[PDB]
Ligand binder design. Structure first.
Ligand code: HDD
Ligand code: HEM
Ligand code: HEM
Lengths: 726, 726, 308, 83
């Protein structure tokens, strides 16, 4: 026995806040959190405690420390089957990563609709508010490999596998409502342009390089999702604080056979929130696993990620009533024109047990639909339907990937398909063909019907010649980028301009910069002029005179496109750093900690070393991390209680902690003599908005701090931060 | 509903004779035949009756007859995910065949010892006569592909997987007691020489070609196994009627640590029996699945294949007591010198459900041993230990092949190995390494011991320098081929001669034939001269004067090496053709069927057409097959009852039936007017040994016929068959 | 030297009739025969005479008869990299066979049109009677595995790769002018029905079994091609003596953009000839490689397969 | 074998030797080299036994392991000198 005698090696099987206990496999951390998919995985879950170590053939091993040799300093023998099995399995652990969205973090949960949607769709999982559907959800970046960093600037994937009673439905979406390109035939061109360049394989997890902006400058259909990536949408604070979208128009089909067009949304119940660039980029260094870690720890704390599914619904007769084509995936449907109707709630409430087996091997594919749904002719969706089945043949080793446990349906599946690599199911049917008489034709086809019927495609009329031709209705590139720009707050616009300026600064061929600036001049001249100034480029007279693109169906803004214009802050699950000193005023710390706990806000006690410090009254304070070990990047706010401020006041790390939090627009609260830190951040005696300060942490100090946290960041500080050397 | 009203599409779930019912998956034909391994497969068996047809993702299919198209004469659409999933799975059905032994037929069963072997081995499966061990057995040929014929001349494999309580033990043997080569480094050379030649990929399933005999002539270590392959050992009648051998000397290890050398044997309880060459070759065209079919139908009839496991045991102190090396796998241990101890019995009593899932995917490997067994330094065994783990990574897709259901142990298996393609087990251990504290070092190593202990190699002393060198003790090639030759009956020697003469006549380069004849002259001058006469080669004076090789430890024969020298005939499970006519004498047919039933011999009723015929008393006789549809090749004996003999007397097919059966040495019985057929096969009026004839089927008539069947073939007929044009 | 003194190990590099010489690799047997594709394969052809035996990394092997062991009767050592490379390669020789038409036999050749077809097609390989296009052709059965027999009753494949100056064109046909089924959606059903049945994997190379005729009896669209298969068309004498067809209607497209419907044919210039059933069946036993052998030996004799 | 897809990884251009390589190994996935040798095995007479083994020597010779002396029993045990 090598475990400590006090049992401190094993995390408690109860919800605990981030950092309080080591993290564990979900079934050991939360054994009573159950759903029908999690229970169905029990046939393959493997324990370990009290069992003998064996080969994969069940032979007990006596010595797992040594190879078999001829003498204890002699050569290794070929007859060592125990060594060779163990090193063979090791040698073949890796499988190909996903071509795109290779970097991702996943969790188990459940979905329930708010009311039956039987009037608009016959989909069984939406038919009854008491029908619970298990889900598995994977969030991801796009460009980087599986070992790249989480808080890069990039689009994020948001993929949900619903294990329904009539089939698996995968809703495979991203966190922006459009994509970069119009037709799937260009997807390898676009992805090869954003990915690391082919001669040297640089840069990882970044679009800030010549080939991406060469392609963008030559393909103005990309400019709308480029706008979203350059905004703070491209750097979410967490997977819990971003929107999701299916992007394409799909169809709902009800039992009377009526089709309604639909676009799918997920609303984050934790609100929308993003990092600022300098913080995101620094965080890819200090904690490249920050979003993976944050998701896992929220679930362990009981801060479950929750999202509301909603639908934009357009009747078939209104297909042509907009200035843009509903089938064009570079266009959004403004919520001012078609509101999102709330449909039901998804809660993610359990981590996987093994990341490879459940996350790495999961396969999502937007062609996995169920009766009550159907596709449209969007030409990006149409090509996606080919790709996701094809790519699993190499990634997951063959055509039996639906037998890997995470991908298995929970409902029945039976057919005439046989064999393939890795075949698990042993069919007993005398027949492997239909029609057959030798098994009375079972399993049998099922007519379409209101419930539990066979799939049938909506009989949409097709009329046209066979052409490789883009619809002229798709040939408008600039009005949606402009609607996006005008919908952002002034600070969000500043952040967009800085995103394009930073990215084009890394493009080495200056002509590519110039061509991008020309495209910006076709969107909005204030944007193009501001990015041009940062690049030292002067707009020509012709550029200054480009006429702005039209409004989108009369709109000159839509606030639902902004992260922040409409307040939706939620503090639960956020975290605050508390900078300790060697003799902390304990009454300050009591007040701080209990106010935080009352609103579900976590704290991390930090100091210049690990171990403990003792407060004014003898209270022993356990230290979570050092200043340098858990930097202000990883927290939402900073609080300094009073005490012996001289302990830390000349500590460079403590001072820089506050400078960094201040640059990144985070709320900071200073009690008592911690107000001496006002000189480090240049705060005036009569103080400034976004800095909370009092003689003590009582009265309204914690309410004021918590108000600031619900507004996320102190945007009014932006003009104050440029002077600051941090 | 497509099945017939009368239910005649479904075979009865009871044992039935060959041809009486359609064959079926084993769990449908024999649902109450169980063993621990068959019951463990229940988690992956899939049924079909009363289930809906679905995609692999569980979506019900309405129309499984058509692709989705734009118009009913229009192009097929890419959004048809149902068509693409079904065609994608089909497109990827095949996996690589085994590099050798690709053609093979398998069944489930169980093994039980006759007594505890704890005095000589601690192997748990041999510890107690009431210990029942499930087995899965695969029989195979060596050279041909998975689609080559069964009754070729070849060595046969005989591989048994024992699913023990302490691990899977695979005993991977062949049907001769030696192999062709001494050192595993030559196995790709030998196998490439026997396989189809590389320019044109000819011949299939045959060693009768230049490159095989080129290698044999240049590698006299091959000649011993070449002698067995050229004898009738190379064309067994059934996998039920051949012996098995592990070939290599292994070790048993007891609880005190004492090592005993062991060679393994399987003795067929249905006795030893082989085809003749003409019959075997012709059967590869009339029924290339003859052995596969016979094994499956024997098991459906209850004629379970039974084998006794036997051990040749040699104390460690007797390693050098023989005049050949015990580690040389081209040498056998004569049973006259070391008897076979009968240790237990294996019964094969259930067919698979699905051939691909259970037979094609099964992985056997001789390095899969358990505590109580160990290896020796036999240099062919030593290299095999590398090959069988390595080859499964491509053949079965990766390192998780032990998770494919047929390969799973039934005992516990736990370790720190993770990932790899199509990983099924979901590990919950917090640790994936040891030593660990975080899971109190579970799963834990186990010291070796008398029962349930960890595996420890026997501490054999190794002394020598690192060399690529054949032991001088292996350098003797002729004395075993000669002992085998001298042990055969005279007709078994004639068949050997004929095997070499046939094969060498197909070698195009005449010098290779000459070099093989020179080798045969080093074995036995009579053999060499008989082969040389058939090739038109004359031995030189030097060849006439080569001294024979020495006896083996004083033996000049061992009758246990002959198939036939000692009678071991068992008729149960054999099959007789009864040639019908349009008015059979019912009293002959009653007596025949009754006597056959009493001995468990099956019959097939044959005629010139399908349907039925009516006997003299009006009995309706159903016809199983035509004379041409079920030739004499497929049966053990032929009986012709009396009746309207004119109906068939001039039928060239019925005459030929009896000519073919006669040429192939089969017992033939003729009742009343059926004796007119004596003229087609030239039998004198006074009759001949091996032709049963009488006025009626009589009962003494049947005893005589069944006596001949217990002796298998009528060897004394051989000088009479050269006349017969058949 | 292991070769005989008289040179009789080596087949004459000139045309010889079947059985006169051992058969050989084509570039050794007929070194003077060439075409543009055979020339382009030269960079990957590997010889052998007068070269040292090496690992795949180019290290010369001294003893290719023994593993490395501790003493000449001792255990094999894990450091024997020569043994492990040679056995690793052997261990991974096989690739999956083709799902259908796994048994087949192939040869190089060339095609030339009799005149320009530019009035009906702008296909380059049909534009000029002087333009010669290399081909590679494989003939096959459908149902059996790669190690099944040649003279079974089955449909035959006839597939031609044309290595044109404007891309590869593959004409992938059969020896009858129709197929068994109408819609590709049913191909896995039809092919599972003809293939060896799934419990026991019998019968090989034969449609004479319950599941095939169950499917036919329930799918009368199959009866046309079944007629062909049951005729002596199902048992050709040689790949040289069978017709070929593309089966489908395709389109030719000329330079003016006009489309013409076309169906493709191959006419055997050796004429049409089939076995009889008892002969074909017994031949699967006496020489399961009869068609592969006959093709190879015709080409070695100069009896070149020719098709129109 | 898994990373690079099979046993012909030495034929991937970067990994190819620049010196000659010839032997009797054949096939495997994505086989590039087309062997013209009538023989795929040795010893052979049909190609006069080429390509041939080469005795070790001072230059251009076959590989031979150094004949280190091995003395000990078959053990899974760490040398005490390593502790
Ligand atoms: C024509 C090709 C194609 C196109 C046009 C797209 N994708 Fe895709 N996508 C792939 C081909 C692909 C892929 C190659 O099939 C991936 C990689 C690995 C996998 O299983 O699927 C994939 C993965 C992938 C994943 C990760 C799924 C997971 O976590 O495993 C997400 C979230 C998306 N995609 C989302 C999108 C959205 C919202 C798109 C446009 C609206 C889109 N993809 C277009
Ligand atoms: C010494 C005499 C040998 C005998 C009796 C023997 C027996 C067998 C048998 C019975 C099988 C078939 C297992 C099954 O039914 O699935 C087999 C497969 C195999 N053998 Fe051995 N073998 C011998 C020597 C060797 C040697 C020296 C090597 C390697 C150098 C070797 C490599 C293989 C390979 C690669 C397969 C295919 C295994 C698979 O794909 O799972 N054989 N052999
Ligand atoms: C229209 C009737 C058809 C004919 C005459 C035909 C002909 C052929 C031929 C001759 C080959 C072998 C090529 C070779 O020698 O390498 C082949 C291979 C194949 N065929 Fe088609 N075929 C037909 C219908 C189909 C259909 C409808 C499908 C599927 C929808 C199909 C799927 C395949 C597959 C999967 C292979 C193996 C190809 C490979 O592995 O390279 N066959 N077929």
């Amino acid at each position: 026995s090598l475990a400590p005698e006090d049992g401190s090696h094993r995390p408690a099987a109860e919800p605990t806040p981030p950092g309080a206990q080591p993290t564990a496999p979900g079934s050991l951390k939360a054994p009573d959190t159950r759903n029908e998919k999690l229970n169905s995985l029990e046939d393959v879950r493997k324990g370990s405690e009290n069992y003998a170590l064996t080969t994969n053939q069940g032979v007990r091993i006596a010595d797992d420390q040594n190879s078999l040799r001829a003498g204890s300093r002699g050569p290794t023998l070929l007859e060592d089957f125990i060594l060779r099995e163990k090193i063979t399995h090791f040698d073949h652990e890796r499988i190909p990563e996903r071509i795109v969205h290779a970097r991702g973090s996943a969790a188990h949960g459940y979905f329930q609709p708010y009311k039956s949607l039987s009037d608009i769709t016959k989909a069984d999982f939406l038919s009854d508010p008491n029908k619970i559907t298990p889900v598995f959800v994977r969030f991801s970046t796009v460009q980087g490999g599986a070992g790249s960093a989480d808080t890069v600037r990039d689009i994020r994937g948001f993929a949900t596998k619903f294990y329904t009673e009539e089939g698996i439905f995968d809703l495979v979406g991203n966190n922006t409502p459009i994509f970069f390109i119009q037709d799937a035939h260009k997807f390898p061109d676009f992805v090869h342009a954003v990915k690391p360049e082919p001669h040297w394989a640089i840069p990882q997890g970044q679009s800030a390089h010549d080939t991406f902006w060469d392609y963008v400058s030559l393909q103005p259909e990309t400019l709308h999702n480029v706008m979203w990536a350059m905004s703070d949408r491209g750097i979410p604070r967490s997977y819990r604080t971003m929107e999701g979208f299916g992007i394409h128009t799909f169809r709902l089909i009800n039992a009377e056979g009526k089709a309604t067009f639909v676009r799918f949304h997920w609303k984050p119940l934790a609100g929308k929130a993003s990092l600022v660039w300098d913080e995101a980029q620094k965080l890819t260094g200090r904690d490249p696993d920050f979003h993976r870690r944050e998701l896992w720890e929220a679930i362990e704390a009981g801060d479950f990620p929750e999202y509301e599914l909603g639908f934009q619904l357009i009747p078939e007769e209104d297909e042509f009533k907009f200035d843009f084509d509903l089938l064009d995936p570079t266009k959004l449907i403004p919520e001012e024109l078609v509101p999102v109707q709330r449909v039901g709630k998804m809660v993610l409430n359990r981590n996987p047990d093994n990341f490879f087996a459940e996350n790495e091997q999961a396969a999502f594919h937007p062609g996995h639909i169920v009766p009550g749904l159907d596709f449209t002719n969007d030409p990006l969706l149409q090509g996606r339907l080919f790709s996701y089945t094809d790519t699993q043949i190499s990634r997951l080793g063959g055509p039996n990937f639906h037998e890997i446990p995470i991908n298995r349906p929970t409902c029945p599946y039976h057919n005439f398909q046989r064999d393939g690599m890795h075949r698990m199911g042993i069919d007993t049917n005398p027949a492997n063909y239909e029609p057959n008489s030798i098994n009375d034709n079972w399993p049998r086809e099922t007519p379409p019907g209101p419930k539990r019927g066979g799939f049938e495609s909506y009989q949409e009329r097709v009329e046209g010649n066979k052409v490789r031709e883009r619809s002229p209705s798709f040939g408008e590139y600039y009005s949606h980028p402009r609607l996006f720009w005008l919908s952002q707050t002034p600070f969000e616009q500043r952040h967009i301009v800085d995103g394009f300026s930073f990215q084009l600064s890394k493009v080495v061929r200056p002509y590519i910069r110039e061509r991008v600036v020309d495209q910006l001049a076709h969107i909005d001249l204030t944007l193009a002029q501001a990015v041009a100034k940062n690049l030292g480029i002067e707009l020509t007279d012709d550029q200054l005179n480009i006429t702005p693109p039209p409004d989108v169906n009369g709109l000159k803004k839509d606030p639902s496109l902004s992260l922040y214009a409409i307040p939706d802050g939620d503090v639960k699950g956020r975290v605050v750093a508390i900078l300790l000193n060697d003799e902390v005023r304990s009454a300050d710390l009591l007040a701080i900690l209990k106010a935080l706990k009352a609103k579900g806000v976590h704290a991390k006690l930090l100091y210049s070393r690990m171990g403990e410090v003792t407060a004014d009254d003898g209270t022993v304070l356990p230290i979570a991390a050092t200043f340098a070990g858990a930097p202000s990047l990883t927290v939402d706010a900073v609080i300094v209680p009073c005490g012996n401020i001289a302990d830390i006041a000349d500590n460079g790390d403590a001072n820089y902690y506050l400078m960094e939090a201040y640059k990144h627009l985070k709320p900071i609260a200073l009690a008592g003599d911690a107000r001496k830190f006002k000189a480090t951040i240049k705060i005036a005696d009569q103080g400034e908005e976004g800095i909370v300060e009092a003689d003590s942490a009582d009265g309204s100090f914690m309410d004021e701090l918590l108000t600031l946290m619900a507004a996320h960041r102190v945007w009014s500080r932006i003009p104050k931060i440029d002077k600051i050397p941090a």
